[PDB]
Design a protein around this ligand. Structure first.
Ligand SMILES: O=P(O)(O)C(O)(C[n+]1cccc(-c2ccccc2)c1)P(=O)(O)O
Ligand SMILES: O=P(O)(O)C(O)(C[n+]1cccc(-c2ccccc2)c1)P(=O)(O)O
Ligand SMILES: C=C(C)CCOP(=O)(O)OP(=O)(O)O
Ligand SMILES: C=C(C)CCOP(=O)(O)OP(=O)(O)O
Ligand SMILES: [Mg+2]
Ligand SMILES: [Mg+2]
Ligand SMILES: [Mg+2]
Ligand SMILES: [Mg+2]
Ligand SMILES: [Mg+2]
Ligand SMILES: [Mg+2]
Lengths: 362, 362
């Protein structure tokens, strides 16, 4: 709570930097400054700050065991905060744009940015472009003479790219691969042959895990100058594991958590998404269940949607989930043990990240 | 012609690199590779390559007067080509996204990408995100151990940001500033008070000049290691001047060039754009002309649009244009003369850039 207020005081400094630079260098007028301040506030705040706060917890962990001057402590914490906000702004970018592509209605308990009456798709698209440019403006401003600058940019960009590739895997997950063709309007799949665990796994590996887990963790290492002190293949394997589970939870909540609690309203059934629920159901259903799933999936019709939920409850998926969670707890503990060998501190940081995720309710 | 085929052979190498990396590192399947190849071809090719080819002409100019080994010549030309393609891919990004926000129908003689039947806004938004990520993937791949890497990235990013800020100035140019408010649906301006030369100038400075002129020119200097050899304040002043004129031509052509020749269809009148034509007309019109302009501007109605064109032809704007062109020829020559002092070669490169622009018909 106190630490989160400190993370937010760094948001305020960053907002101030960005907005004063708009006035001093980009000829902005007060009203457009205001619009951009409100956009930044609306798209970047109100979340859990899980990605940002991870950078900071990684850095705090190394600080407890590493000798530094006070001044250097303070710089390290401040950089971890800036780094954290780069990742939040990056997420803010993805969500503004994602909400347009998913035809979404609510986000963090409010309308999606593009649905604000004075915004619309026309302004929102470019607003999301601005959120991303801001990540880079921050990096070059606050990290210009840090040793980790080049490594951080290069990583940030590879993570952004994988994420965008992931979003392509996601937005085309309901069409048949052999039919993808810019020239031909795309029909929803009728056989659901590509609703498989491996295909699902590729969607999720790219669209969520790099930017939600790999980036904040390695970012925490960069600003700590601690990345040579870990086994990177382990960091990857653990980001990919927890990241996958994180997205599985997102999928279950889309169907089962009231929006009242969730803060977004779920579109996966209507959007015909290759979600965990749809893949898992099709891996256990009998012939008649499959036939009725195929009869109602991917239509915006309330009673079709309700038939899918019923088939999901009947297949007892909220116990396939428990079985999957159980295999994940196993594998995460095992990876944490393997990380303990070169860095107890980073292993603990990961234990904390796993814990925050496992207990997640939104 | 031969040189342009050589620029295009570097596009093919780049396309091949990017697409093989998708297969070897991002788990892509052949059909999505194909979709991305067609997207890249459709959004990046078919233009004039003016921005890309400028990087290359800048570099060629320095090569004629600078001693190098043959191998070093060849590397320099190849880097200028890669650099050029970074700028084309960047433009490709902006146009895909711009066409969505302007509700545009045609581009480079074909439907806008988002209008392809098998694309739609849903895929196009993210496709445009990919085009931009590719610029960075290229830079880090082909320029990893070049001395100019850091300078180039930093410049590229500041230019991208200014451009995005410019696009915000553009997409809000028809509303009153004091009324911009995310919460309130935005009405078109009724007084046209902000349709002024200074306001127009700010739109254009940001949205076109950085990325169309400043970037390719300084890029040509980076890959040549020649940037200390110029007066950068002059490079800026000349990019901003020719860039402004470039956009003025774009505005006139939107109204007056048949789409048959233009390769896009014009939306400025219907979109209520603060174009050069609308600003210039309002700077010379009598009270009754202003009243009738305000009666018909910014409606998608064919006969309202036709009344604006008629008022434009009656105000003899295609002679305000000639007067403006004449002041621009003056000022460009003067800047070229001033550049002659430290680099005849770069001055000549600019003379060529001015020439290609001045003679432009699309
Ligand atoms: O739409 P998704 O996939 O279920 C959600 O989790 C968005 N998300 C997660 C990861 C990545 C991205 C993403 C990445 C790039 C571009 C757009 C979105 C979106 P949502 O439930 O909050 O809508
Ligand atoms: O729409 P404009 O402004 O008239 C055009 O020239 C696009 N353009 C030029 C410069 C910058 C950008 C731009 C920059 C950032 C984001 C979107 C577009 C667009 P068009 O006539 O080809 O449509
Ligand atoms: C599933 C993913 C990757 C998108 C949502 O991430 P969060 O659920 O962390 O959203 P916010 O906390 O930022 O609101
Ligand atoms: C006016 C601007 C800045 C956008 C169009 O640029 P071009 O007219 O050069 O478009 P292409 O050559 O790339 O088609
Ligand atoms: Mg979504
Ligand atoms: Mg999505
Ligand atoms: Mg979701
Ligand atoms: Mg346009
Ligand atoms: Mg535009
Ligand atoms: Mg135009």
């Amino acid at each position: 709570m106190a630490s989160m207020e400190r993370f937010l005081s760094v948001y305020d400094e960053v907002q101030a930097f960005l907005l004063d630079q708009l006035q001093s260098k980009y000829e902005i007028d007060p009203n457009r400054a205001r619009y951009l301040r409100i956009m930044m506030d609306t798209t970047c705040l109100g979340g859990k700050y899980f990605r940002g706060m991870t950078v900071v917890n990684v850095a705090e962990g190394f600080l407890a065991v590493t000798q530094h001057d006070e001044a250097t402590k303070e710089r390290i914490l401040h950089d971890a905060c800036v780094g954290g906000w780069m990742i939040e702004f990056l997420q803010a970018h993805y969500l503004v744009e994602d909400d347009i592509m998913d035809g979404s209605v609510m986000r963090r308990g409010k309308p999606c940015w593009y649905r604000f009456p004075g915004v619309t798709t026309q302004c929102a698209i470019n607003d999301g472009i601005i959120l991303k440019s801001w990540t880079q403006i921050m990096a070059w401003h606050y990290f210009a003479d840090r040793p980790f600058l080049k490594d951080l940019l290069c990583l940030f960009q590879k993570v952004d790219y994988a994420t965008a590739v992931g979003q392509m895997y996601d937005v085309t997950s309901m069409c048949d691969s052999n039919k993808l063709d810019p020239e031909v309007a795309q029909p929803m799949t009728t056989d659901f042959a590509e609703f498989t665990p491996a295909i699902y796994k590729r969607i999720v590996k790219y669209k969520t895990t790099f930017y939600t887990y790999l980036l904040p963790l390695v970012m925490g290492l960069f600003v700590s100058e601690a990345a040579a002190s870990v086994e990177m293949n382990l960091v990857e394997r653990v980001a990919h594991l927890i990241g996958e589970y994180f997205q599985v939870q997102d999928d279950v909540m889309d169907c089962f958590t009231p929006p009242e609690q969730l803060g977004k309203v779920g579109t996966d059934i209507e959007d015909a998404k290759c979600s965990w629920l749809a893949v898992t159901f099709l891996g256990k259903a009998n012939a008649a269940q499959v036939a009725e799933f195929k009869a109602n999936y991917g239509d915006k019709d309330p009673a079709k949607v309700a038939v899918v939920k019923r088939l999901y409850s009947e297949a007892n998926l909220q116990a396939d989930f428990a079985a999957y969670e159980a295999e994940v707890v196993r594998e995460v503990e095992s990876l944490i043990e393997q990380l303990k060998v070169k860095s107890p501190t980073f292993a603990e940081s990961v234990a904390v990240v796993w814990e925050k995720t496992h207990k997640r309710k939104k």
